[PDB]
Structure 1
Amino acid sequence: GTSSAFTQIDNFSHFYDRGDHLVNGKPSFTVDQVADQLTRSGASWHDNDGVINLTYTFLTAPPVGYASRGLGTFSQFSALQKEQAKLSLESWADVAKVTFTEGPAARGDDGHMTFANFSASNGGAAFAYLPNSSRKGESWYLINKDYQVNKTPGEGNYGRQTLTHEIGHTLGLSHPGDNPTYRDAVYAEDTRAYSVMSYWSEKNTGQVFTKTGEGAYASAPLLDDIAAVQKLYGANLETRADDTVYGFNSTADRDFYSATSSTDKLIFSVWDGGGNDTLDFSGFSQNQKINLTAGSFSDVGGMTGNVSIAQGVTIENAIGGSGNDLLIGNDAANVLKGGAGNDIIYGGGGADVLWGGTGSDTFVFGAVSDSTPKAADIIKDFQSGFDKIDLTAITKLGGLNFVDAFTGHAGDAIVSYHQSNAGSLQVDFSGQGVADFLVTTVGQVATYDIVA
């Protein structure tokens, strides 16, 4: 078999797998299947210039016919609502080729949106209309003594998510399905771990974002929302196309991608147009599981299934926190830093740069192609006697034959050291008489530091 360390990596890499199986008695839909589900109405703004340009207005007065809507007292968005709305708009503009510009309807635009508040509960907490309706672009928000959620929207709270959600609706995203409960959902991933359009809590899919008495809501489009809006309007490859850090020490310039404290509750899906990117979760003390696979989920900041990388996005680096984390790279050359604590790092393909950090770390390899002589991983701070190079997924615990020179026998391995403080582990898995696997290190590696 393999070690527990490999099994932990493998299990996590597949933990959130989607499609072709039932979950909660419902079909599991892949992100693409959900993108179809979320755009099933066929409604969308139309271009052309290749980009949809919408204008929007925070109404200062009730439109003609307003009183017949039964919404009660009309009121303009406060400065705080406008500020948050603009952030929500931006979060959609960031991922899809649609822009929002404050201003009255204009002949040159592709559509016009309005925002305003109403006071009569009978209207609902908030609502919006699809872009093919007579009230295309409109979204309305309830505010009265009995319902105060929309009066103070802010990063992470439902008021901000409501703005994001209603706008997603004005863009053409439907709610995931048609007292209903998650039981009536069409597919398993109909929860707010996957889409801000869902009415159901992440608890239904097992993720944990917060506890009773506290609110925790993604302020920006989540994984499936990004796929859905991009299916409608095209991916916006221009955003953050330069090098970007998400999380702690964020350089994304977005409130929902920034962490400044260990208690921060991050719930976001990373969209990026290119650049050597990093997921920095160094400031957390809780166990984390970071997956750099595109379209995959990570357990971050003491929560689970709360961070994801959008389909089509390549993230190159990850920095774990002080807990005992799992770090999973992708095919690209990744720089993975464990942090304090005992981490299990799996570079994947390409020539990775691995930092175990303090603590006792395990560097897992699941295939020979993971670390070849022509593209060898380098463990930058290997600590003999504490860290481990785990090849059990390859050897299946068959063991290795440590020799000073390859004999032509499969399984022969050579541990070397150069007193540039550089070590290396070479292996001839295929038995060709030469190394087909190579891992270099800064710091000595001993035969007893290898699990095979």
Structure 2
Amino acid sequence: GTSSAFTQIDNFSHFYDRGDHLVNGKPSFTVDQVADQLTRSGASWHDLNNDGVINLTYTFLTAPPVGYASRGLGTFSQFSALQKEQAKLSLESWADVAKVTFTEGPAARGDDGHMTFANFSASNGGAAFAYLPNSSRKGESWYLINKDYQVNKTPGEGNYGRQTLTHEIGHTLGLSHPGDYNPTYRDAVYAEDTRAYSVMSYWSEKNTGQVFTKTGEGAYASAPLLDDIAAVQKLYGANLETRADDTVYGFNSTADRDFYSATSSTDKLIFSVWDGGGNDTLDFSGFSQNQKINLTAGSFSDVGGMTGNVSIAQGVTIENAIGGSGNDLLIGNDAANVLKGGAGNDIIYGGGGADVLWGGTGSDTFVFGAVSDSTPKAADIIKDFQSGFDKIDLTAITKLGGLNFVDAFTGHAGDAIVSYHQASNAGSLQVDFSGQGVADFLVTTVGQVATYDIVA
């Protein structure tokens, strides 16, 4: 067996596993499988000028097009400045992940296509609608506005007015709904068909167990989520030029995107991280709720008192993570990561590569699941180890067999050596798991480590 600390880590890393199993009686689909499902119509824009990207233009209509009255949409009206500002933010988030550009202007000669945005007042027209890129109205999207329906009048980060724009633009890009779909999630074709995985879904995250808000309140992702991202990149290619240098997401964010920014402990973040390279950090230092942060590509995290609301896109490598003042879990990846616990009692799992770990205040547990996690040639470093408070857990390696603390390796498996260098305040832990008479596991610390601070 293992310790509770390790079990909590292993559980969270598998908590959102997708594929090859039944969930809610429906098949669980992987991100790749969903990317195919959302693009099953075959409709897309084309690179007419062959420059390796889809360059599109758009116009905020100022007057009803020819044949407009035959649509039955009622009174025509131009987008307001608010809508124009939000539409641009929606277009931008799509342009960040896929090789597509959107430039305001009239249909031009070298464009691969043209888009249009406008409003109507006749409810019969629905809350909003768009057309696929292979239709005769390719590029068009329409939004309802009247006394009885006002959500499109004040679109804004986090509200349905903004996700609507992002959703309709999705359609114009060639994305379909997760299913053909009175309809309910029961009619879904796969399990992850909820707004927790894709803004194209009609169902709430509640169907899959996630928790974003309370009744009476609304909370919707403003930008393309995990599956949406995969879907569009599969169509137009991933944009690696986006934020290719060091980036911070969340608190103290440097991503310059409203939906990746947190300035209050009450903020509700719902996003999927797309990044192009560099040493990146997920800073969630401003929240007081227990969190669970996973730096694995394509994985989900429970951020700011919510669950399954944050994720990293497939093919993205994020290097660092900062917990809040609650008791959190932090899981790194194969890269060298800087993992910060913050206040509270945290459990930190470095993974592969030499990692830098910071417990913070509170009793913290640095967990190791394999020997390859902290080797002599690539050992982790605990910068703030507090003897008699913190612990080093090797329970997943020793499986509770214990260690034999000695001063020098005798050539027996399980021999462990805890040393301290009172001059540099540096401590270390060595062990001979294989029993070859030399160390095959090393953990360096800034702060004296004792024999009792080790759990095995």
TM-score where L is the length of structure 1: 1.00
Q: Distance in 1 between matches of 2:217 and 2:334?
A: 38
Question: Equivalent residue for 1:220?
Answer: 223
Q: Distance in 2 between matches of 1:76 and 1:411?
A: 74
Q: Distance in 2 between matches of 1:359 and 1:438?
A: 24
Deviation, 1:115, is 0.3
Deviation, 1:122, is 0.6
Partner-residue secondary structure (3-state), 2:452: helix
Question: Equivalent residue for 2:331?
Answer: 328
Q: Distance in 2 between matches of 1:192 and 1:447?
A: 49
Deviation, 1:3, is 0.4
Q: Distance in 1 between matches of 2:25 and 2:337?
A: 37
Partner-residue secondary structure (3-state), 1:389: strand
Q: Distance in 2 between matches of 1:180 and 1:388?
A: 52
Q: Please list, as runs of the form range in 1=range in 2, the aligned pairs for 1:94-173 lying within 5 A after superposition.
A: 94-173=96-175
- Deviation track 1:320-348 (CA, whole Å, cap 9, x = no partner) reads 00010000000000000000010000000
Question: Equivalent residue for 1:39?
Answer: 39
- Deviation track 1:190-217 (CA, whole Å, cap 9, x = no partner) reads 0011000000000000000001010000
Q: Which runs of 5+ in 2 are unaligned?
A: none
- Deviation track 1:376-428 (CA, whole Å, cap 9, x = no partner) reads 00000000011010000000011100000111111100001000111101111
Partner-residue secondary structure (3-state), 2:77: coil
Deviation, 1:261, is 0.3
Q: Distance in 1 between matches of 2:400 and 2:429?
A: 17
Q: Distance in 2 between matches of 1:218 and 1:303?
A: 13
- Deviation track 1:154-211 (CA, whole Å, cap 9, x = no partner) reads 0000000000000011000001000100000010000011000000000000000001
Q: Distance in 2 between matches of 1:208 and 1:119?
A: 34
Deviation, 1:37, is 0.3
Q: Distance in 2 between matches of 1:215 and 1:281?
A: 22
- Deviation track 1:246-295 (CA, whole Å, cap 9, x = no partner) reads 00000000000000000000000000010100000000000000000000
Q: Distance in 2 between matches of 1:75 and 1:20?
A: 49
Q: Distance in 2 between matches of 1:197 and 1:176?
A: 7
Partner-residue secondary structure (3-state), 1:448: coil
Q: Distance in 1 between matches of 2:72 and 2:194?
A: 31
Instruction: Give the CA RMSD over aligned residues.
Output: 0.4
Question: Equivalent residue for 1:240?
Answer: 243
Q: Distance in 2 between matches of 1:349 and 1:249?
A: 27
Q: Distance in 1 between matches of 2:360 and 2:44?
A: 49
Return the match for 1:410 from 408, 413, 426: 413
Deviation, 1:361, is 0.3
Q: Distance in 1 between matches of 2:131 and 2:278?
A: 36
Q: Distance in 2 between matches of 1:242 and 1:401?
A: 46
User: Where does structure 1 differ by over 6 angstroms across 4 or more consecutive aligned residues?
Assistant: none
- Deviation track 1:122-160 (CA, whole Å, cap 9, x = no partner) reads 111111010001110000001000000000000000000
Q: Distance in 1 between matches of 2:109 and 2:192?
A: 40
Q: Distance in 2 between matches of 1:281 and 1:124?
A: 39
Q: Distance in 2 between matches of 1:214 and 1:220?
A: 19
Q: Distance in 1 between matches of 2:256 and 2:36?
A: 30
Return the match for 1:444 from 445, 448, 452: 448
Q: Distance in 1 between matches of 2:261 and 2:222?
A: 12
Partner-residue secondary structure (3-state), 1:287: coil
- Deviation track 1:356-380 (CA, whole Å, cap 9, x = no partner) reads 0100100000000000000000000
Question: Equivalent residue for 2:379?
Answer: 376
- Deviation track 1:211-238 (CA, whole Å, cap 9, x = no partner) reads 1010000000000000000000000000
Partner-residue secondary structure (3-state), 1:197: coil
Deviation, 1:107, is 1.1
Partner-residue secondary structure (3-state), 2:146: coil
Q: Distance in 1 between matches of 2:150 and 2:391?
A: 54
Partner-residue secondary structure (3-state), 2:417: strand
Deviation, 1:354, is 0.2
Q: Distance in 1 between matches of 2:288 and 2:25?
A: 35
Q: Distance in 2 between matches of 1:414 and 1:75?
A: 76
Aligned length: 452
Q: Distance in 1 between matches of 2:314 and 2:206?
A: 23
Partner-residue secondary structure (3-state), 2:93: helix
Partner-residue secondary structure (3-state), 1:446: coil
Q: Distance in 2 between matches of 1:55 and 1:328?
A: 42
Q: Which runs of 5+ in 1 are unaligned?
A: none
Return the match for 2:299 from 296, 299, 305: 296
Partner-residue secondary structure (3-state), 2:268: coil
Matched, 1:15 2:15: yes
Q: Distance in 2 between matches of 1:354 and 1:157?
A: 37
Deviation, 1:439, is 0.3
Deviation, 1:445, is 0.8
Q: Distance in 2 between matches of 1:146 and 1:435?
A: 72
